[PDB]
């Protein structure tokens, strides 16, 4: 066993071998220097995963055919080790911390797939359901089946950001509006469909991108209309919208990222803290039908909210991105994270969020890094 005990940080390690992509949990004592790698170390995870924390616990979240998840904590002897299973129906369409000691999943049933969706609450330290409460998927589906984007909870609400989309076609016919559902916890009840037309709507295809709450308890939107996040279409400029903790309409915040960055769309966010964002932002103006999906292209930036401003981290270079999924991105002791996959292999890249510059880390021996996280002992 080449583990490291206490060692903080966790990453998964998606590695492709023979066609296939396996996952490795590992950990690293430090990100600066030296070589994170899976050779005689790591949780091996089959099968198609992708990674939230919250707490002491990450949640090794299955997909494509994995239907649960699987907590990964740190044991008193400093290694990790699997804890707990939470079984769901398909997909865990959004996932979200909803206070100290819970999460909330949202799961989806097409329309002949069922019609009730189920909101789970799930105990942190347990990784197990401690309800769960069906509801109808109308209105999400009033226009289109929904794609959803992010889930955020507020003060006994439960909001929801999505897209119309097409199952079969992908077509994605409505981008004039952002939309979010809100729901009343626990029973989920319908509260309102809250519109905007500043902007289109929020996040894109399972980037877990559409919505983030920050210290105030206020929640802000992205949107980014990106095709090459897998829209069809874009008609709004992408853009950041404000909705008041725990209220029910946007408020008058609106920050146009499409002409402050010259053109260029959000592609993933992290909120760093006061009012600071770390984004991939695709450098491709316009995007066409030619980039769909494919997330090319990508710089790293600091969006400020304050002063609605966005700043190039120009030590890090273009690379491509992971795609629908969610940003594996650190905020650890005042800096921001980043594996960067690029034509040299995978670093770690440490940002200064106010300096807007990066200092190059560690190199990583992976395909690409599917979580990143820094897990103490509880």
Same mark, same amino acid.
């Given at each position: 066993n080449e583990e490291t005990p206490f060692a903080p940080y966790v990453l998964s390690l998606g590695i492709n071998s023979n066609g296939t992509t396996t996952y490795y949990v590992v950990t690293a004592p430090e990100l600066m220097s030296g070589t994170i790698n899976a050779v005689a170390k790591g949780i091996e995870q089959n099968g198609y995963r992708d990674y939230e924390q919250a707490g002491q616990t990450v949640f090794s979240i299955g997909g494509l055919g994995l239907t649960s998840a699987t907590g990964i904590v740190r044991d008193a002897n400093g290694y990790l080790t699997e804890r707990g299973d939470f079984v769901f129906n398909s997909s865990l369409n959004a996932f979200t911390q909803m206070d100290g000691q819970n999460m909330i999943g949202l799961e989806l049933p097409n329309k002949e797939s069922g019609d009730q969706m189920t909101l789970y609450t799930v105990n942190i330290s347990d990784v &197990? *359901? $401690?309800?769960? +409460?069906?509801? /109808?998927v109308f209105p999400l589906n009033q226009l289109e089946w929904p794609s959803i984007t992010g889930m955020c909870y507020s003060e006994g609400n439960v909001y929801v950001t999505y897209f119309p989309m097409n199952p079969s076609t992908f077509e994605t016919l409505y981008t004039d509006t952002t939309f979010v559902a809100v729901y009343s916890y626990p029973d989920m009840q319908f509260k309102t469909l809250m519109k905007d037309t500043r902007t289109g709507p929020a996040g894109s295809w399972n980037a877990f991108n559409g919505i983030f709450k920050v210290e105030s308890g206020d929640m802000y939107i992205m949107s980014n209309s990106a095709i090459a996040n897998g829209f069809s279409q874009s008609t709004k400029n992408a853009a950041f919208l404000? *909705? /008041?903790k725990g209220e029910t309409h946007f408020d008058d915040y609106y920050f146009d990222f499409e002409t402050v960055s010259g053109g260029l769309k959000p592609a993933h966010i992290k909120y760093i803290g006061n009012g600071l964002v770390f984004a991939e932002v695709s450098t491709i103006s316009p995007q066409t039908s030619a980039d769909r999906w494919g997330d090319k292209s990508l710089k790293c930036c600091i969006i400020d909210l304050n002063n609605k401003t966005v700043r190039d981290i120009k030590e890090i270079p273009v690379h491509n991105g992971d795609g629908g999924r969610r940003f594996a991105a650190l905020v650890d002791g005042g800096y921001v994270y980043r594996p960067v996959t690029? &034509?040299?292999? $995978?670093?770690?890249?440490? +940002?200064? /969020?106010?300096?807007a510059t990066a200092v190059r880390g560690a190199k990583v021996s992976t395909t690409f890094v599917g979580g990143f996280f820094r897990l103490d002992l509880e």
């Open positions: &197990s *359901i $401690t309800s769960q +409460v069906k509801a /109808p404000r *909705i /008041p690029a &034509s040299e292999g $995978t670093y770690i890249y440490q +940002v200064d /969020p106010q300096a």
